[PDB]
């Protein structure tokens, strides 16, 4: 349950960094057009006894085992979409710092072309 | 025999070992989850804040075309 | 090498200039300090750093201007922070005075945290501490931050348990222990606050941290097969007949099916200490 | 067969360990980053709104 | 190929073009097309040309009067001798590295840093440059408290010393992570890993204090009594003291049947037992 | 907030809404548009990758939500999703739903209790669930 609960709260969070992309990416259009428009401007136990006391006990570690296995798919699946978000964020981290950079060098521009 | 009762102790030793594995791991995944959750909170902040920042940008070039428009 | 002595005969001739620039009577002079101010991190002088920071923050401030001044201030204090504590803490409450003028909770709250640590870690003092996190707590609660309210709460309570009274402690685990009782993701950790508050009823007496276990035992049914209830059943018996030898035999046997957090042992050992 | 068992048994736990291991220092960077992001973001925000606003009353002083 | 041609025909028809434009206000022109051009001579995947052209551009937007433009073009160039002769890209990344401190980001100076001894390392086999840029990354991280990069910086450094022969400071980086890890409730579980590794750094040395390390490391860290590192370590270093191949030589292979050896702890393994 | 969301073309979303809708219905009573929500959800989730270890939990759902109706027409549609989606058979659910079946058809309640105990014990139940299997108690 613990596993099922991150996973299902790791896919909403890639969603997000999608609309976050998105929004960075038509910000940054938007700012370099009003700039130009701006420039343009200007078993499990062995056998003893037998009995219960082993095979019931190795039939609950085989269901162990089982789930043991499903927590294995989980683990990767979770691991394979960290791995995306990853490099999303690394690709965003770019486009903000390039408009920041934009932004800067026209109030630059601006306080210089003014006099 | 004795033997019987020897291998029923390291059975149960191995079984203990496996205890302690099982909890291992999920002292591992209680870990995990607090830090996902901080993260997901986290990103829904960012989120905000960017879509606050995204509605002035549309305000401001919505007034700037207006003021562009008209002064012409 | 060159690093060093270039660096600082640039930062001193941007400041004489600047100081010229600023007895001929703006802009160009706070920019020429924040450019020396950044020679002189470049410089590795931690120390004087803040100082051109702070005076560019208030010659930027002399004209209204606040982001900046706020920004500047709030870099001059992280600055300051290894080269004085006590100058960056002080431009930390600026910063965080200026926050709430405009009305900025969550950088306001991150500051504090952040002098929390700070005093903590470099200076000694626990008062301090935990005013600074109960602020941040109530900042974070006031802007439905769940999360960093309730760990600044399970701060501010492991403290006063290390030194103040069990009372503040008992409350605050029992709030949070209720408040995660539903959460799906926290419920497996519920359990565990309300241990520590059981303990915490130990030191008042006996009667009062059987009855704490009994409540919350009835609060929560599953608290009952914990593991928990059955070692603070025995501790609760041993303590009964005064026997110290089935007190440390339960802490053993606890010891050795789960380690401990340092915490447990300690209290643990108070009430043995207190058994008589 | 109690070899076989016991030892894959073993192995799937240690690579188990060793992929959360990894998993948890991916997560660690990347919430660095993000804090990074929000404190970028958010004075980028801050700026451009302060350079907007002088704009404004600018062009109202001069018109 | 006929597309690489076509393309590197275009890329060349372009560059001829810009050339003749500036050599006809004009600056920003002549750095626009400039950079157009640079930028298809990529597409042209030609790397030497294309980033001679991409560092031409970038000098003659210097000449005009612009900061973090510049350091862009440098990087792009920089980014693109990455498939050529490595000193112009390692020059082009130091200029970067120098005009962003200059302008005060420690943290992409530190990125390029790493970015640099990376390619320095896997192109070259100079350590050394490398080890100093991963040094200087290291002090720029934790100058910023990017906890997370100087530790990764820290124990890269460990790794290529203990490798070098340089033990002591590879075992007091380890030291130091390992500590660093106990401190926060995070990260706490490679602590083990890391004063395995120490151990086997100060063994390096000689055998009779390693009893004493391995004391040190144990009170420290108790649960570290239980992992199956210190178990290993322990039986390994009495194999050792009987001067037979068989015992060490029995208990590694029972702990590779477990997960395949890594090859700077099967290296160190090797250098250990054969003397 | 569903409809909005389905227009915006922002799925994974409206399904949690359209999932609580579902639940509420059902502890209205009104068990035919939750049944059909539920088995559009989990038709929908079955070849997601990440949803698909949940998506045979809306079945079960379902069938305790189909129970209610009578036994005939929940056991067809238990043999449909089960035979939908195969990998159902070896969640615990087909073995709990087959059991409190065969316990109803001899109006046994005893094994039913007995049934519904033990899976309470292995695993928490919840109060949707109880509520849902004591009304199935009445009959």
């Given at each position: 349950d613990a596993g099922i609960r991150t996973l299902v709260m790791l896919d909403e969070q890639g969603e997000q960094l999608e609309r976050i992309e998105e929004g960075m990416d038509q910000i940054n259009k938007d700012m370099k057009e009003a700039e130009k428009n701006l420039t343009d401007l200007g078993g499990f136990i062995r056998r003893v006894t037998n009995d219960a006391r082993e095979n019931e006990m190795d039939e609950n570690l085989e269901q162990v085992s089982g789930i043991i296995g499903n927590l294995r798919h989980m683990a990767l699946d979770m691991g394979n979409e960290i791995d995306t978000q990853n490099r999303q964020i690394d690709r965003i981290m770019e486009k903000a710092d390039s408009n920041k950079t934009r932004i800067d060098e026209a109030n630059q521009r601006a306080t210089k072309m003014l006099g | 025999s004795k033997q019987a009762l020897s291998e029923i102790e390291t059975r149960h030793s191995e079984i203990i070992k496996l205890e302690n594995s099982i909890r291992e791991l999920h002292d591992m995944f209680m870990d995990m989850a607090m830090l996902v959750e901080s993260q997901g909170e986290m990103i829904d902040r960012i989120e905000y804040n960017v879509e606050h920042a995204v509605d002035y940008v549309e305000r401001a070039v919505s007034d700037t075309k207006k003021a562009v428009k008209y002064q012409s | 090498g060159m690093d060093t002595s270039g660096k600082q005969a640039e930062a001193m001739a941007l400041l004489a200039e600047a100081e010229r620039k600023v007895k001929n009577s703006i802009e160009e002079a706070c920019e020429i300090y924040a450019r020396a101010a950044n020679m002189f991190k470049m410089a590795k002088n931690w120390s004087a750093a803040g100082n051109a920071f702070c005076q560019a923050a208030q010659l930027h401030l002399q004209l209204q201007s606040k982001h900046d001044a706020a920004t500047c201030f709030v870099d001059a204090g992280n600055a300051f922070k290894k080269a004085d504590p006590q100058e960056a803490i002080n431009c930390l409450m600026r910063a965080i005075e200026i926050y709430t003028d405009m009305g900025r909770f969550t950088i306001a709250a991150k500051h504090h945290i952040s002098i929390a640590e700070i005093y903590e870690t470099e200076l000694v003092d626990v008062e301090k501490a935990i005013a600074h996190y109960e602020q941040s707590a109530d900042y974070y609660k006031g802007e439905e931050s769940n999360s960093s309210a309730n760990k600044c709460l399970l701060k501010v309570a492991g403290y006063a348990a290390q030194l103040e009274q069990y009372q503040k402690a008992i409350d605050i685990y029992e709030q949070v222990g209720?408040?995660?009782?539903?959460?799906?993701?926290?419920?497996?950790?519920?359990?565990?606050?309300?241990?520590?508050?059981?303990?915490?009823?130990?030191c008042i007496d006996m009667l009062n941290a059987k009855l704490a276990v009994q409540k919350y035992e009835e609060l929560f049914p599953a608290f009952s097969d914990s593991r928990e209830c059955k070692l603070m059943k025995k501790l609760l018996e041993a303590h009964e007949e005064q026997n110290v030898d089935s007190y440390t035999e339960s802490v053993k046997e606890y010891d050795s099916i789960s380690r401990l957090d340092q915490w447990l042992t300690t209290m643990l050992l108070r009430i043995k200490k207190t058994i008589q």
């Open positions: - | - | 209720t408040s995660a009782m539903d959460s799906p993701l926290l419920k497996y950790s519920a359990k565990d606050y309300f241990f520590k508050a059981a303990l915490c009823h130990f």
